[PDB]
Each structure stands twice: as structure tokens, then as C-alpha cells.
Amino acid sequence: DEEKIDCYPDENGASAENCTARGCIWEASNSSGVPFCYFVNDLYSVSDVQYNSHGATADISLKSSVYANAFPSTPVNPLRLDVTYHKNEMLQFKIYDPNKNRYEVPVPLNIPSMPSSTPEGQLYDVLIKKNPFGIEIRRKSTGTIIWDSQLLGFTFSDMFIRISTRLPSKYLYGFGETEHRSYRRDLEWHTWGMFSRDQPPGYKKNSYGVHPYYMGLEEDGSAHGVLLLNSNAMDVTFQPLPALTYRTTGGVLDFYVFLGPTPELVTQQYTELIGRPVMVPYWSLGFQLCRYGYQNDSEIASLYDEMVAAQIPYDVQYSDIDYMERQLDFTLSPKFAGFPALINRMKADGMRVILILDPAISGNETQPYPAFTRGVEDDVFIKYPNDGDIVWGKVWPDFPDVVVNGSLDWDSQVELYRAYVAFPDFFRNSTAKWWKREIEELYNNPQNPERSLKFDGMWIDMNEPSSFVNGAVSPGCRDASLNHPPYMPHLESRDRGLSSKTLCMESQQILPDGSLVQHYNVHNLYGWSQTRPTYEAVQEVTGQRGVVITRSTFPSSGRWAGHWLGDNTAAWDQLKKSIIGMMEFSLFGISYTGADICGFFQDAEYEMCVRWMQLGAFYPFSRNHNTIGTRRQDPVSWDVAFVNISRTVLQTRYTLLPYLYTLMHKAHTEGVTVVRPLLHEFVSDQVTWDIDSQFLLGPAFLVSPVLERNARNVTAYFPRARWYDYYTGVDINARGEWKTLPAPLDHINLHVRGGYILPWQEPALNTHLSRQKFMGFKIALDDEGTAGGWLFWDDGQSIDTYGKGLYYLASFSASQNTMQSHIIFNNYITGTNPLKLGYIEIWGVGSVPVTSVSISVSGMVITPSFNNDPTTQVLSIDVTDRNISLHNFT
């Protein structure tokens, strides 16, 4: 019943007789999911197979054209398979066309210059199985088979490719941006679409990004990861006999397999190939505020001031497209002059500002509009292939004299009000200058230096590329590259073809090398094409590190950017998904992520929004965004109760900051994860394979959120190790157990893994005041392990600090009643430049109040006073009184 490989997933035409023309069997069924039409024999035969020390290779040819010709496109013949043993932990294998040069995905990966695999160390081995054609990758260590494509259905045709594989287990994690319902994916007959779309998340709907990467857990504890380097419109299909099916619409099949034994290792090797996450500036770790629809220039200041009054800390203030004159890039609304004033004033208090930018530039504008004009001069816009004119879409920008009525049909609006817009092709070295220059003159306004916006980071959005008209503007498109590309993957609005809510598939783009590519093959690649130049724009213009948040991602997209999870609704399910979403992106190689705290779409509810500020106070990207019409939902728009609560939780977060910042450091330099699923640190505990309602930050910090409405208590799993309650210092005392901890409406349970020590800093109203205050420690010993830890300090905003000199890195170990400090490299914390060391809590010291030694060193020893309660293992040790700094301590 499984083992049935759906022969007819085509949008139209599935039928008993149409199913026989393809060499298949049509047997109707009463079981949900199972394909009436399925395969009974192959159409390609692997022919010649050769092994060597550094790989394998084989030929694939047709038998017979009679049936292959009945499938979507024109089969290619023959094919060729090249399996390369790169490292001992990583493989690639690719099936391409040896004859004609097919579209291959133009993202740079790193790869040992020469296959560096050794027989003693090679961790896998591969066969090319002969009948039916199949590839079998295997972990040498145990027996387990990682990949097994010796299932039927393999198809190759210019614009339709299908390969399949057997999963070694019932545990599969992560795929290209969509709203999955749980972390571990279903397998019980499910198809998911993958294609850059402007889709608010929804079950089974292709959304902003595309990520054909998954992690698979094995029968024992072992983990592996697989990547399909394909940027064409595809879907994947999960089946109950553990097995999935790729159906791309046409590149080559470039696969990379990683098999570090552990989840964290899998991810280190994955990101090693595509690239490790960006390093964020310290200030980006702060809380953030924004909304679609700030009216008055000063409705913002009114907000910023109402916040600092309630002493609810927050580092970043935004503006949506309202700051723009009629939603035009690089224009300032009259309703918003002396916005520049606001910026400069807030950045002066120690705040930071991020600004949104869409990609679509308006060309129906009558006054002078540099952006669009110099855009046409430098020729940076996307246009049809036969020297045709620009491909005109529609998005936010309005026509110049038209009078807008919010009340109107949303279609009505798109026709009467919305200006024609051009889409810059971000591959071109030419579109780089233009873009960097527009960004440039936003920061340093050449004409009106009094209307310069001094942003700190850029938020590119609406870049899938999203257009409000399916295809292009007036008559439309004219093609078959566009609608019914022979196989129309299982996307949203399937009946609308790929044109839907975006550009014409035939639209020409030009790679950086100079060759010509059609939008068909690079659409999933668009927002990615735009990410690095934006990251560089903010870099050059601000002289600083900066940060970029982008909507559309592709693998390696996170090497320059972070990502938020898009247009969620203010609904209770949406809390749990933000956890899922974050974790999946940790996998995808994007560590700076989060959701729209309290919910973008629709009106916030008081309780839900309390809960969400609590959970979200622990997103690496903690922002409270909201759509246009809805009532405001920021922390100071509720009541004293709320304000008071938001203070407590945001304080807690501003404490974790030095730890969170080093996790960001480790993630950038080691590849390791940030928001880290429980199963990643406790793999042998199969209870964690399935828990997706709580997460770690790095290894030591366990966040156990309340995600239900009326509930004021939470059952949460606690793995085999020590879990000290972050607030009080007491070990909960569950080991591999489900507790039901108490959770008031003003509380969210945090716990610290015994064996780890967390640097922590005193909370300020913003990172600027915060970094000056007292640096603490929190040594969580374990009966289970004693204690380890790291801190990384930095000017928190310079470019490539680590990679060139000016940084500080120290490991910390507590063995027997005494904790030491090994400074690995120092270059930022000098005598003249001090890091105040305040307190030094320590939990789990024993019920015996007797120290064998009770006092600290610096080079010179001293015996300060301390509070020890034997009941609750705590051992507090205030030190504000000394002249103790981080560079002279021991």
C-alpha cells in the first residue's frame, strides 16, 4: 500500500486510461492519501558503474521512450551520476545532463579544493544499485541506511524531475518555509509546496522562503542531514512507509549529504558548506517595536516616550512604509518630516532605529524621483527577454495625484490607486551600485541634509518578489514557462500557475557572471539575490556592523541576514508555531529569527498578548509588530498590570544578553545552533524527539512557555540533568520527567542546565546603558556535571571584530568548590577599559555551609562577605565594592 509511488500528481488528467498511457496501474482505493495511480516499473536503467577512492560514477539511460514520453515534459537522455566523497562527514551526488548544460543554482558553497576523504575516517559508504536504478548511502558505523532511492518513479524531463527515497525512520525535521503543525513531520501521505510566495503562513501553503533541507533522526541516536541544491518550483511528498518524494520543475539534482553523528554536528557541517549565520550587533538583541500604520511622525515619539516612562527596556524603534511618501522607496512623507529629528534624538539616548524597504520601484511618478530614474539609466530593472520593456507589477506605491479611499475593495484599490512598479534585478553588479547608492543618499541626503534618516539596520521585505498582480500588469504575460509549466507543483492557488502574486516566469535576469537566466529558474532566489548587497549597503554607509532582516530566504540566505516569520495572525496556535519556525530556521542556517510578538494580523487580546510578550521575550529577534487597522498592542497600550509584567520579563531577557551574544558568536564561528530543540542536547531521550512546545537557547537555558489560553499552570518535560529555576536558584528536581510547574499570568518558567555557567548583566533601559553596568555570573553546578561556560565581549558593533583583533574570549570552569577563569584571547578589555564585575551567584553547592575556602583572587587574594542558605543551595557573593574587572579576575 505504501511503496506506491504516486504516478499521477498532475494538476489535471488523472484517470484510469490516462494512467495506463504512463506505464502505470490504476487501482482506486478507500484509504486516505494513497494514489489511485502508481508505478510498477522503472523507465531508466543505470548502465555503467565505476567506483574509485574519491567517489563513484554511472550512466543512466531510457527504456523505453514509449512511456517516458507520456510524462509532463520531454525526458532527457541520457543522464549521468557523479557521487563525490568530499570530506569524511559529507558527500554530494548529482544527476545532470552530460550533453546540454542545464540550469544549475548560482549560490557559492565551500567545498574542499580536492576530495579529502580517508578510508579509515570516511563515515559512510555508497553503492549505486542496479535494478531498479537507485543510490544507497549508508552509515559505516552502524548499519543504518541514510538514503535509498531504489524506489520507483524516478523521472527526468526538461521541466519535471522526480527522485524518491526511503527514510531510515519515522522522524524527519524541517522543510522550505511553511507553517508546519508540529516540529516532527507527519509522513502519513502529505504534500508540501515550495516556492517564494507572499503567503501569510498556513498549513500546506508555500510561504516566503524555500529550503529543500531536512534533518533525519535514525533508529538509534544518530542524525544526518540532506540538501537539494535546487531553486526551481517543487513540492515534496511524505509517505507512511518512511519515504519522501521530490518533484522539482527543472534544474539538475544536486544533493549534499551530511552525517556528523549528532544534530549539532549535522548542522555545523551543513552550515559549513552553505555558510554560518550572520553575527548581529549587540544592540539587535534588545526588544523592538514597530507597526504598520504609524500616522503622525510623532505617534512614534509619543510611543518611545511612553515606554521610557514605564521603564520597559527596548533598543530598536521602527517605521513601516508610512515614513515613505506614498509608499515610495527613499521618500519622506510630509506627515513625517522631523522624523529625522526623532531618529537623531533617540539614537542620542542610546537607542537604535531600523527602516523598511521594498524592492519594487515606482515609475508612474511626475516630480523628480532619482531612485527610479537613475534606475533606468544604470538599467537595473527586470524586463522581458527580446529587448522588451520593463516588466511592470503593482505593490504598495500610489499614483501621484490619485485620491485614496481605504474603504474600497482590495482589488478595486490595486487598479485605481496602485502605481506601476519595476523590479530591480539584484544579481547585476550594476544593481548593486544603484541600491548601495540609494541607501547611501538615505543616510546622507545630498540635497536636504536636514531630511537625512540615520538608520542602524535595514529591513528588506515584500521581496519574494511579491506583486499584487498575477504575472505582470495589463494584458499580462504570454507564455507556457509561466502557467502549466508541464508539471504545476502543489502550491497555493495552483490554478493560477507560477505567475501568481509575482513576476513573469519568462522575465529575464542576468547572473553576476553576465549570462542570461529566466525568472523561472531564479525566482526562489530573488530575495536572496538582494540580501548581501543590502547587508553591504548598511555596512559601508553606517561604518558599522548593522543588521538585515529579510522576508524571502534561500539556503545561505542567513549568511548576511536574519529573518522574521512573517505575517502571522493574533491567534493562540500562533504561539506554538513561532517555536517550531525558529527551530526549523536554526536548522536552515539562520540564527537571528523570531515572530511578530502579539500577532501581526488582527486585534490583540490581553491574555494572549501577555503570554506572547513572555515567550517572545526569548526570541533572538524579539519584536512586537502589528498590521494597519488593528488596535495597538505594544506594552504601553494595555494597563498598569501589563506594563508592570512586560518590565519583569524584558528585564530577565536583558540579563541573558551576554550569554545570548556569545551564543550568537558561537553560531557564527562554529555553526552550532541558537534556538536549539531539546532533542539536540538529549538525543538518547526519545521523549525529546517529539517535544516542540519548549526550547533551549544554546545548551544551558530551557524556556518552558505557557501557550494555552485560560491555563495558569504548565506541564513541561525535564530531561535527565539538573534544572535550576532561573529566578530562585533552586533545582526543580525532575529527571527525565514530566512536571506540572505553577505558571501565574505574570510568570514564565526558565531553568538553567546544571553543568553550565552563564554570564549575565544588569538590565538597563537599553543596551547602551546596560553594557556599562555590572557583569554577573551564575554557576549552575550539577551532581550530573560540575560546571563549564563561555563569555565573548566585543565593542558590540564593529565589523568583523573577531576576525581582526579587537575582541575578548574566555572559558570558565568550576571543578571542586572553586571556579577559575581562562582568558583565551584579550584585546578589548584593558585596565583603561574596564568591565565591571558585580555579583557571582552559585547554585547546588551542597547542604554543608562549610567551605574548604571562602574567598576570591585577582592576582591578590581577598575574603568578601556572602549569603549562603543551606536549604536552597544558593551562594550569593556581592562584589560591587571592589575594583574587580573581567580582565584581572581568577
Side-chain angles (χ1 to χ4, degrees), residues 184-408 410-432 434-450 452-470:
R184 158 187 163 186
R185 279 286 80 207
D186 196 305
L187 310 189
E188 218 69 56
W189 298 108
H190 294 289
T191 276
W192 297 80
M194 289 184 299
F195 200 60
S196 279
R197 165 172 242 267
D198 172 358
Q199 242 311 311
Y203 176 88
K204 276 194 182 213
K205 291 174 182 165
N206 50 128
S207 252
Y208 309 105
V210 156
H211 282 269
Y213 170 89
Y214 80 80
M215 170 179 296
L217 261 210
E218 291 158 57
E219 188 100 336
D220 72 313
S222 295
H224 69 281
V226 181
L227 157 62
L228 209 217
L229 228 223
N230 198 339
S231 72
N232 289 84
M234 66 176 66
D235 58 41
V236 299
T237 314
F238 301 116
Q239 321 193 342
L241 125 74
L244 59 57
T245 324
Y246 295 93
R247 289 186 287 235
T248 212
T249 48
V252 312
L253 292 179
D254 202 356
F255 281 94
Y256 296 72
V257 198
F258 325 92
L259 27 69
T262 52
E264 296 291 304
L265 256 302
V266 155
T267 294
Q268 281 175 274
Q269 309 153 165
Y270 174 47
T271 53
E272 187 190 351
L273 160 88
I274 78 186
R276 320 188 159 320
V278 206
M279 176 61 121
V280 299
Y282 194 111
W283 62 258
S284 53
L285 291 166
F287 186 62
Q288 317 193 36
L289 282 185
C290 182
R291 102 165 290 180
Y292 186 24
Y294 286 143
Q295 287 280 4
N296 308 278
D297 163 32
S298 59
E299 197 170 52
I300 292 183
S302 189
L303 171 59
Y304 168 102
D305 285 330
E306 189 171 4
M307 285 280 287
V308 321
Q311 309 162 55
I312 306 191
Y314 99 109
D315 277 80
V316 186
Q317 170 76 55
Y318 283 74
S319 168
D320 224 315
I321 49 182
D322 310 277
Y323 81 82
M324 296 165 173
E325 187 182 324
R326 280 148 43 236
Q327 299 62 241
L328 301 161
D329 282 344
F330 313 117
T331 72
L332 189 62
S333 182
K335 210 70 214 147
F336 252 100
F339 180 37
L342 221 194
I343 296 310
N344 290 123
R345 170 190 136 195
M346 288 179 313
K347 299 190 53 164
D349 293 10
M351 296 278 292
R352 301 258 177 175
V353 149
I354 295 185
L355 295 167
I356 182 166
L357 286 168
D358 308 309
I361 301 303
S362 168
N364 251 243
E365 188 85 29
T366 48
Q367 302 286 344
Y369 188 36
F372 173 86
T373 284
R374 352 151 68 138
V376 186
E377 302 181 20
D378 298 350
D379 185 11
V380 295
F381 291 114
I382 292 185
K383 34 178 153 51
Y384 299 108
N386 309 317
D387 325 343
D389 212 34
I390 322 231
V391 182
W392 292 106
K394 291 196 160 189
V395 216
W396 299 124
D398 304 43
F399 287 108
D401 287 283
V402 84
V403 174
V404 10
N405 181 12
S407 313
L408 264 173
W410 183 91
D411 296 317
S412 296
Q413 295 206 218
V414 171
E415 223 239 338
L416 308 186
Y417 305 173
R418 295 296 111 94
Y420 290 46
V421 294
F423 291 92
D425 173 347
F426 288 99
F427 283 95
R428 312 192 185 172
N429 281 342
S430 109
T431 305
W434 174 74
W435 194 244
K436 285 183 210 149
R437 195 219 294 117
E438 242 42 42
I439 294 282
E440 147 63 33
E441 293 167 18
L442 210 188
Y443 201 67
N444 303 313
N445 198 334
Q447 306 290 195
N448 312 26
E450 25 91 43
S452 289
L453 300 176
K454 293 287 169 170
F455 57 63
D456 279 305
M458 205 59 73
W459 165 25
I460 47 198
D461 161 53
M462 210 71 41
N463 71 340
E464 5 281 337
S466 172
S467 155
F468 288 159
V469 299
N470 302 319

